[PDB]
Design a protein around this ligand. Structure first.
Ligand SMILES: [Mg+2]
Ligand SMILES: [Mg+2]
Ligand SMILES: [Mg+2]
Ligand SMILES: [Mg+2]
Ligand SMILES: [Mg+2]
Ligand SMILES: [Mg+2]
Ligand SMILES: [Mg+2]
Ligand SMILES: [Mg+2]
Lengths: 109, 32, 131, 287, 97, 250
């Protein structure tokens, strides 16, 4: 019917993301009964789904099919998001780099 | 593309024409 | 000709027919079972690796002869860190031969290749560890 | 794992990224060039390259080795010699521990070959399977094993634990249906009646010591007593246990299965079992 | 001269058509099709080879025994001379004897 | 609401299953609706590119049957007589015409009729080839899973934009269990186009999914081939072809 503009694969983690996701972890789990919440596990699929589903549509970054099975505990999800990811062509990033004047690279497309 | 239909064996027995010579005789026999 | 039918005899036909899956063996009250059989311990031991059993729930240690003189023994399905396993068997078989083994490993297939038959030694070694 | 976390970063696999295990497919070496091309590994001059060498085992007119040796009766009538596959009671103890064949029911060559204990090649003229004395220790089967051949130690070990041993001869086409009946059940013909043993194995299958199915039951207590007297072990009268009836379940001659009998046609699709119900047909199948 | 002065026309390679897109399909009908059929009866070809391998002799003897009665006289005559020349060739000519 | 699948087969104690997202085609923006844990031994096998080499090119080869042929000096017409006397003339000794030397003569070592490169691999190797095929897809995030292949619009335009909006790839496969239950909407789309091909679960093979840049399954299909390949893993010894009946296996 209508195709909205595509979402850019590039994504950078905003500040205080730990506070944002932690506020939602307490929303899913009444309240977080045990301390040391970083070691909390996600054996159930409903808990893992509602957790990862809110993270994606709220931030704008989806966990691939190859990594969610590795995201066993919550701290792994914290390490997967605090690291950034980028999306630009090699020509774009090389031109963005501080190349010297003598060097030049073209793009014949 | 829609794939061609899956090859399946003939449902029910296979009774050849007895008055048809290219059909071998062991089908006409009682053992078949 | 005539023919009369019966169906009560059908139970003998299914006792006669074979199966298509290996049944999980009975839980014997006494272990080790006769014929030197011993199922794997449960839960497994937390390690960098693990060795699974075969279709018949046996140990995947096998022998092989090649060139008429290559008198070796192999293991098939090492899972995880093979370097930890091959180091253990190297230290285990070292004092028997007086020298460190010079065996070969293939972490792609997860296999080992050890000179000399030590299957009876490796079987008892893997059983007492609980693989 | 350490294997999968590499592939997610590594590029996608396709036909261009495809390669076999190095060392499997060695490269073909054709005789074209300087190295092979000159003579292609056939020699300088002679029958070696001309292709007119003699047959295999030729000594250049001298008598070959295979004619100077005299003939002797090594393998004559090998297509009719007596053959049977071994079976060790060690394996029987092993297979029941695995649970593929149940000791609660009578063990049989059908239950055995349905368990894939040992292969059998009836067209390779093996009329059954024998028991093997190797495995006398660590044996508590208590099974009613059906066999063709049997050793003295195997019978003593089985009877000591309370089991039952019995010989039962099968013909070639009567055995291949026994070891594998279901394809004949895809044919629809009636299962054939067994025959008596041949004109030389009848003294064996009629003797009581070897547990012959033609021998009397009255003589088996005597043979059991002598084995207990021989190998020094108590003789457990198996009449006490609740499953004594199961242990004595045996098939008469001219019958394959304890349930089925000759003439009984069986069907699986729209499962039905049929009789002839003719006096001429019925009275022969009993014969 | 063997080479050609002018180039040939650029042959268009259609990597997405009915055959190449549906290539390799229905090869595992036995593995995950409850073994109702074998992949050997799938292939379209002569009747003297449907799921079977053979050398020059093996394919020829299978041909004359199966369809030789339907073959032509000239083709059948050349077939007998072929196997007769190849029978003696493999048996008498070559290395390894 | 979410759609969860829990594996019905048993799993090893020392290998946990692997979760995977689930999608659909009712809406456009709809993504990540439902999960499905998967058996590790079939979805986490080693890479084994040598296995893919054999089984993929195997189905390239065994279906091939040649038709090339060259007439030998006996088959080419003529060449029965001797053209000239052995020592009568200066010309080189030649027994007849149509030899490999003469023009138009028969070939000495050439193609011989329709050959057959047919050879069957072990069922366990071919099965394991299927086990490892969709495994590497899971590592590379190439495959996808969804509930059913229904869409209201049903045209190639919506299907194409849906693909490279989720960034699947150029070439895709569609899988279903049987040949009858495919909706008429999705099948009419795939028939018009060529890239986003469609096949049933019975016709699933490694070469198509390796040729196509991505893969798609349905939850009934995921349980189907899982039951088959795990049954191949815990398989019993084959005494006879599986076409004949069994006790538990149909
Ligand atoms: Mg070997
Ligand atoms: Mg010489
Ligand atoms: Mg010369
Ligand atoms: Mg000569
Ligand atoms: Mg001629
Ligand atoms: Mg002439
Ligand atoms: Mg001549
Ligand atoms: Mg020509």
């Amino acid at each position: 019917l209508v195709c909205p503009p595509l979402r850019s694969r590039a994504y950078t983690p905003p500040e205080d993301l730990q506070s944002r996701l932690e506020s939602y972890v307490k929303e899913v789990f009444g309240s977080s009964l045990p301390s040391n919440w970083q070691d909390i596990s996600l054996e159930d699929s409903r808990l893992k789904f509602n957790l990862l589903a809110h993270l994606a549509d709220d931030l704008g970054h989806v966990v691939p099919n190859s990594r969610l099975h590795q995201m066993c505990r919550v701290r792994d999800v914290l390490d997967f998001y605090n690291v950034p990811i980028q999306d630009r062509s090699k020509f774009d990033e090389l031109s963005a780099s501080n190349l010297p004047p003598n060097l030049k690279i073209t793009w014949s497309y | 593309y829609r794939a061609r239909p899956p090859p399946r064996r003939r449902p029910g027995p296979r009774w050849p024409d007895p008055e048809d010579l290219l059909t071998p005789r062991w089908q006409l026999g009682p053992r078949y | 000709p005539r023919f009369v039918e019966s169906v009560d005899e059908y139970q003998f036909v299914e006792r006669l027919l074979p199966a298509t899956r290996i049944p999980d063996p009975p839980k014997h009250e006494h272990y080790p079972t006769p014929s030197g059989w011993q199922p794997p311990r449960d839960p497994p031991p937390n390690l960098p690796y693990f060795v699974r059993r075969s279709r018949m729930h046996n140990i995947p240690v096998y022998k092989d002869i090649t060139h008429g003189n290559r008198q070796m023994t192999v293991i098939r399905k090492v899972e995880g860190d093979i370097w930890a396993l091959q180091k253990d068997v190297e230290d285990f078989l070292s004092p028997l031969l007086g020298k460190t083994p010079v065996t070969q490993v293939n972490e792609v297939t997860g296999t080992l290749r050890i000179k000399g038959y030590f299957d009876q030694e490796l079987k008892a070694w893997l059983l007492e560890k609980g693989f | 794992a350490r294997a999968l976390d590499l592939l997610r970063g590594l590029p996608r696999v396709s036909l261009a990224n495809l390669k076999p295990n190095p060392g499997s497919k060695k490269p073909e070496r054709r005789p074209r060039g300087r190295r092979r091309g000159r003579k292609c590994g056939r020699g300088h001059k002679g029958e070696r390259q001309r292709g007119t060498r003699p047959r295999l085992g030729f000594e250049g007119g001298q008598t070959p080795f295979y004619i100077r040796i005299p003939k002797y009766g090594f393998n004559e009538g090998h297509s009719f010699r007596r053959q049977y596959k071994p079976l060790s009671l060690n394996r029987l103890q092993y297979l029941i521990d695995l649970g593929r064949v149940d000791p609660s029911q009578p063990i049989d060559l059908t239950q055995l070959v349905n368990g894939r204990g040992v292969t059998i090649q009836p067209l390779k003229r093996d009329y059954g399977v024998q028991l093997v004395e190797e495995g006398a220790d660590t044996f508590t089967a208590k099974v009613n094993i059906e066999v063709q051949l049997a050793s003295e130690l195997a019978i003593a070990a089985i009877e000591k634990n309370g089991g039952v041993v019995t010989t039962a001869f099968y013909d070639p086409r009567s055995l291949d249906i026994v070891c594998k009946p279901v394809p004949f059940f895809l044919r629809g013909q009636p299962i054939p009646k067994r025959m008596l043993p041949p004109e030389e194995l009848v003294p064996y299958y009629t003797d009581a010591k070897n547990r012959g199915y033609l021998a009397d039951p009255a003589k088996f207590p005597e043979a059991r007593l002598e084995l207990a007297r021989k190998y020094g072990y108590i003789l457990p009268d198996i009449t006490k246990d609740e499953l004594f009836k199961m242990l004595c379940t045996r098939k008469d001659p001219r019958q394959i299965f304890f349930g089925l009998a000759p003439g009984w046609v069986v069907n699986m699709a729209d499962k039905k079992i049929l009789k002839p119900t003719d006096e001429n047909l019925l009275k022969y199948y009993t014969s | 001269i063997g080479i050609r002065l002018t180039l040939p026309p650029p042959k268009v390679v259609d990597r997405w058509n009915e055959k190449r897109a549906m290539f390799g399909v229905y090869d595992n009908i036995g593995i995950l099709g409850n073994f109702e059929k074998h992949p050997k009866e799938l292939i379209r070809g002569p009747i003297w080879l449907r799921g079977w391998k053979g050398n020059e002799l093996q394919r020829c003897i299978r041909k004359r025994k199966m369809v030789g009665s339907r073959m032509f006289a000239d083709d059948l005559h050349n077939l007998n001379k072929r196997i007769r020349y190849l029978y003696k060739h493999f048996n008498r000519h070559g290395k390894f004897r | 609401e979410p759609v969860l699948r829990k594996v019905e087969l048993p799993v090893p104690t020392h290998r946990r299953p692997v979760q995977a997202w689930v999608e659909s085609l009712r809406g456009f923006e709809q993504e990540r609706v439902g999960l499905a844990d998967l058996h590790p031994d079939v979805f986490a096998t080693a890479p084994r590119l040598d296995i893919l080499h054999q089984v993929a090119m195997w189905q390239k080869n065994f279906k091939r049957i040649s038709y090339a042929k060259t007439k030998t000096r006996a088959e080419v017409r003529g060449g029965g007589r001797k053209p000239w006397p052995q020592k009568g003339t200066g010309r080189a000794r030649h027994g007849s015409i149509r030899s490999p030397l003469w023009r138009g003569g028969g070939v000495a070592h050439g193609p011989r009729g329709p050959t057959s490169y047919y050879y069957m691999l072990p069922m366990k190797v071919r099965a394991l080839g299927l086990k490892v095929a969709l495994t590497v897809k899971l590592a590379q995030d190439d495959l996808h899973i969804m509930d059913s292949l229904e869409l209201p619009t049903g045209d190639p335009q919506y299907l194409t934009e849906l693909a490279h909006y989720r960034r699947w790839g150029d070439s895709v496969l569609l899988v279903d269990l049987t040949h009858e239950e495919m909706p008429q909407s999705i099948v009419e789309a795939t028939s018009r186009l060529k890239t986003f091909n469609l096949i049933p679960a019975v016709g699933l093979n490694v070469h198509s999914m390796l040729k196509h840049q991505t893969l798609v399954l349905t939850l009934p299909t995921v349980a189907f081939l899982e039951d088959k390949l795990l049954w191949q893993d815990s398989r019993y010894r084959p005494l006879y072809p599986f076409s004949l009946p069994y006790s538990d296996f149909p």
